[PDB]
Amino acid sequence: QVWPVRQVRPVTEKLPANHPLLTGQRVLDALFPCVQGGTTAIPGAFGCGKTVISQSLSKYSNSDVIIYVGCGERGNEMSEVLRDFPELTMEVDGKVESIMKRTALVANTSNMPVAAREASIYTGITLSEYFRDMGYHVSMMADSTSRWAEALREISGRLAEMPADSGYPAYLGARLASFYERAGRVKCLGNPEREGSVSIVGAVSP
Amino acid sequence: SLQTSFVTLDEAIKITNRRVNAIEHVIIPRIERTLAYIITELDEREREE
Amino acid sequence: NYLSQPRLTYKTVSGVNGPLVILDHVKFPRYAEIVHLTLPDGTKRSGQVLEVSGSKAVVQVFEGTSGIDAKKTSCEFTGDILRTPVSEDMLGRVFNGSGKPIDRGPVVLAEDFLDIMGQPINPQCRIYPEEMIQTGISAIDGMNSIARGQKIPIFSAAGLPHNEIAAQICRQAGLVNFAIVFAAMGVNMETARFFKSDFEENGSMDNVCLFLNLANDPTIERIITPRLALTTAEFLAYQCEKHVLVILTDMSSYAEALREVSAAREEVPGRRGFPGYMYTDLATIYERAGRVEGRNGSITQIPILTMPNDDITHPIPDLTGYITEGQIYVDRQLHNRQIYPPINVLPSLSRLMKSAIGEGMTRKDHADVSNQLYACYAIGKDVQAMKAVVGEEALTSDDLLYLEFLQKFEKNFITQGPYENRTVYETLDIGWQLLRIFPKEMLKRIPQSTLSEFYPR
């Protein structure tokens, strides 16, 4: 099938989040828990060690499916993710399996077309909402939402829109609210009765 | 000798701590508010242009 | 008389840009008219005529311009401006931000069709509001009293409990029943659930009208949502004679949608990129409140605001405070200290308080006690700011009295918990107890005739 990236995929009902998303980390799972269908931010900066979040979600979480989005990363930083992710493994029914059997990557270096950099999170959430509709639990990771908001600033700048707040377009907050609003537990469309969810983790770089 | 030194030195510690608190709680905030206003008004002049 | 002549339909779309569609060969265009658009895929959308010039009309489309085309898209012109069907059946209904039902009930059978824009009430026919509402919240009732018919917004910020305070006010308001009309602009589903749940949990829902525009709904609906809600409050108040409380949820979502619309027309910007006319626009919403001559009903407005980066000088809280009759201010520094409600009294105001209180209204001390609590709280803040530089050993016993008042005021007068419902008289006597700490000659806002009657108890 084919679906427009900017249209929210419909559901029978949209439900309160209840069950924890496990990471396998004592901090996080005890002190600062996330629900399946939740929304989270992390500080995306160099020395802080972001990879423990990404690897805990990818290897150990009670997700069924993983979607990873690069928004506009440095050439060599993107290369480390695409090097490491295929090499990760988890154990399933007493047998070791690759992480890439349940994972898809959206990848953008800072020289990819600016329209791809801005579409990146809309592609990744539309891919996530498609596996939610099968009755799975999907985790989405956005590598930096600041790198996406800079592409949004470049496009509105190329269109010569009014520079509002710090040069960002007038709609910056409406686009971010409409994006994170797609997270949640749902009762899916159509006949076999089922529930699924998308959880969003999104890094940000002040 | 030690006690007259000690009384003088106690006063000097109190004065020094008072200056550190004034720099931290009076002076630095006034500079940071001023700096934030300047950064804001420069964006307003730029939007008018 | 009815519009008995038939509607014209046009394929003459000459251009599309931003949120605007531009028709040509239009027969005698009407400014602010409503237009219905049918897209090539059969989707219906609506828009309003934003400009006319000769044979051309410019339409803004409420659901956006995506997928409109110059050849197959078709526009029907309704012959009229935007009107809403209104009836007393609308209490106990849920609608979206364009007034379509979402509760699985039917469409409204109108008792009348009303112009969404309202109409300015004559200042000769306004009655000044003087009946105090007891919210039972001491930080409001004792120091910012609300008259029935006021505009008094809640200035808050992201992460603060302004939903819970607004729900407590709806749960507790009465004179020393309200019908509730509730509008939401740009809310997340957990905010929409919170209010609908609370109104059903208090059994009140058969006496509440809700308009919901959520964070994923169209942005340009947000600029008509509060005008649909206030048109419903004006029918209920000024024709059906009810007392209406109108809640407008996050006016910063309304202002942000208004900026986004105006930025596409390239109208003159004001501060921080908002439209040059934003004061007038907000004033057309907030002035739709009060009492009037010869009619029993009234409209009270409590708009809720999110202040960007907690800045009260930002154009949204700024131009709102210039229009509204005060504000209640919710403070992050009190919320971080786990106090509820987080109402910091110093940036807060009520203008209509001055005549809604005192002898016969509440109690003879109310106007004196309130002003002395403000003075001691302001001085207590100044001593706490002095302490941070010089340390406790520098403070005289008179400074320590104000710094003891400060601690007891925030624990006894401010802090309350979510279902406690104090009388005005409890709030006043909790007032005198904190003031009693000070030797009476320090109470220099209070005249001798008040002190000699109430301080010795």
PDB file of N, CA, C and O in Angstrom, chain C residues 115 117-126 234 238 283-284 287-288 292:
ATOM      1  N   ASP C 115     -24.622  35.164  14.204  1.00  0.00           N
ATOM      2  CA  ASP C 115     -23.339  35.569  13.640  1.00  0.00           C
ATOM      3  C   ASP C 115     -22.214  35.295  14.635  1.00  0.00           C
ATOM      4  O   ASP C 115     -22.216  35.802  15.755  1.00  0.00           O
ATOM      5  N   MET C 117     -19.230  36.305  14.960  1.00  0.00           N
ATOM      6  CA  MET C 117     -18.435  37.470  15.349  1.00  0.00           C
ATOM      7  C   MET C 117     -19.046  38.261  16.502  1.00  0.00           C
ATOM      8  O   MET C 117     -18.417  39.185  17.010  1.00  0.00           O
ATOM      9  N   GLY C 118     -20.258  37.917  16.932  1.00  0.00           N
ATOM     10  CA  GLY C 118     -20.984  38.667  17.943  1.00  0.00           C
ATOM     11  C   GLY C 118     -21.277  40.081  17.473  1.00  0.00           C
ATOM     12  O   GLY C 118     -21.343  40.348  16.275  1.00  0.00           O
ATOM     13  N   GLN C 119     -21.461  40.996  18.417  1.00  0.00           N
ATOM     14  CA  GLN C 119     -21.778  42.394  18.146  1.00  0.00           C
ATOM     15  C   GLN C 119     -21.484  43.229  19.402  1.00  0.00           C
ATOM     16  O   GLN C 119     -21.951  42.853  20.474  1.00  0.00           O
ATOM     17  N   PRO C 120     -20.713  44.324  19.336  1.00  0.00           N
ATOM     18  CA  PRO C 120     -20.360  45.106  20.514  1.00  0.00           C
ATOM     19  C   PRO C 120     -21.573  45.587  21.318  1.00  0.00           C
ATOM     20  O   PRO C 120     -22.454  46.263  20.790  1.00  0.00           O
ATOM     21  N   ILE C 121     -21.611  45.245  22.607  1.00  0.00           N
ATOM     22  CA  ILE C 121     -22.614  45.731  23.559  1.00  0.00           C
ATOM     23  C   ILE C 121     -22.356  47.210  23.834  1.00  0.00           C
ATOM     24  O   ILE C 121     -21.216  47.626  24.015  1.00  0.00           O
ATOM     25  N   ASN C 122     -23.416  48.006  23.888  1.00  0.00           N
ATOM     26  CA  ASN C 122     -23.367  49.430  24.176  1.00  0.00           C
ATOM     27  C   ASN C 122     -22.900  49.672  25.628  1.00  0.00           C
ATOM     28  O   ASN C 122     -23.548  49.164  26.539  1.00  0.00           O
ATOM     29  N   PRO C 123     -21.846  50.464  25.906  1.00  0.00           N
ATOM     30  CA  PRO C 123     -21.422  50.801  27.263  1.00  0.00           C
ATOM     31  C   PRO C 123     -22.508  51.402  28.162  1.00  0.00           C
ATOM     32  O   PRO C 123     -22.447  51.235  29.373  1.00  0.00           O
ATOM     33  N   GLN C 124     -23.537  52.038  27.601  1.00  0.00           N
ATOM     34  CA  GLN C 124     -24.722  52.467  28.349  1.00  0.00           C
ATOM     35  C   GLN C 124     -25.492  51.278  28.957  1.00  0.00           C
ATOM     36  O   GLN C 124     -26.054  51.404  30.041  1.00  0.00           O
ATOM     37  N   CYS C 125     -25.552  50.138  28.271  1.00  0.00           N
ATOM     38  CA  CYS C 125     -26.329  48.964  28.658  1.00  0.00           C
ATOM     39  C   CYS C 125     -25.547  47.963  29.506  1.00  0.00           C
ATOM     40  O   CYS C 125     -26.131  46.988  29.968  1.00  0.00           O
ATOM     41  N   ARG C 126     -24.243  48.153  29.718  1.00  0.00           N
ATOM     42  CA  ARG C 126     -23.463  47.314  30.633  1.00  0.00           C
ATOM     43  C   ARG C 126     -23.834  47.630  32.073  1.00  0.00           C
ATOM     44  O   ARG C 126     -23.982  48.791  32.437  1.00  0.00           O
ATOM     45  N   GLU C 234     -23.376  33.691  24.784  1.00  0.00           N
ATOM     46  CA  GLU C 234     -24.235  34.863  24.596  1.00  0.00           C
ATOM     47  C   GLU C 234     -25.706  34.525  24.394  1.00  0.00           C
ATOM     48  O   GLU C 234     -26.560  35.235  24.908  1.00  0.00           O
ATOM     49  N   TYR C 238     -27.801  35.878  27.464  1.00  0.00           N
ATOM     50  CA  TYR C 238     -28.569  37.081  27.140  1.00  0.00           C
ATOM     51  C   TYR C 238     -29.907  36.817  26.454  1.00  0.00           C
ATOM     52  O   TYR C 238     -30.656  37.764  26.243  1.00  0.00           O
ATOM     53  N   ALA C 283      -9.149  41.397  22.094  1.00  0.00           N
ATOM     54  CA  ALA C 283     -10.206  42.202  22.689  1.00  0.00           C
ATOM     55  C   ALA C 283     -11.591  41.845  22.159  1.00  0.00           C
ATOM     56  O   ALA C 283     -12.550  41.881  22.924  1.00  0.00           O
ATOM     57  N   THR C 284     -11.741  41.426  20.903  1.00  0.00           N
ATOM     58  CA  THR C 284     -13.044  40.958  20.414  1.00  0.00           C
ATOM     59  C   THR C 284     -13.523  39.671  21.080  1.00  0.00           C
ATOM     60  O   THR C 284     -14.698  39.352  20.977  1.00  0.00           O
ATOM     61  N   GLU C 287     -13.803  40.979  25.535  1.00  0.00           N
ATOM     62  CA  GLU C 287     -14.906  41.895  25.839  1.00  0.00           C
ATOM     63  C   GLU C 287     -16.291  41.243  25.730  1.00  0.00           C
ATOM     64  O   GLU C 287     -17.279  41.864  26.109  1.00  0.00           O
ATOM     65  N   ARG C 288     -16.401  39.996  25.258  1.00  0.00           N
ATOM     66  CA  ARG C 288     -17.651  39.216  25.225  1.00  0.00           C
ATOM     67  C   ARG C 288     -17.911  38.560  26.581  1.00  0.00           C
ATOM     68  O   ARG C 288     -17.990  37.341  26.702  1.00  0.00           O
ATOM     69  N   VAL C 292     -25.669  42.779  31.684  1.00  0.00           N
ATOM     70  CA  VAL C 292     -26.348  43.822  30.890  1.00  0.00           C
ATOM     71  C   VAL C 292     -27.668  44.249  31.528  1.00  0.00           C
ATOM     72  O   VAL C 292     -28.224  43.549  32.367  1.00  0.00           O
TER      73      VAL C 292
END
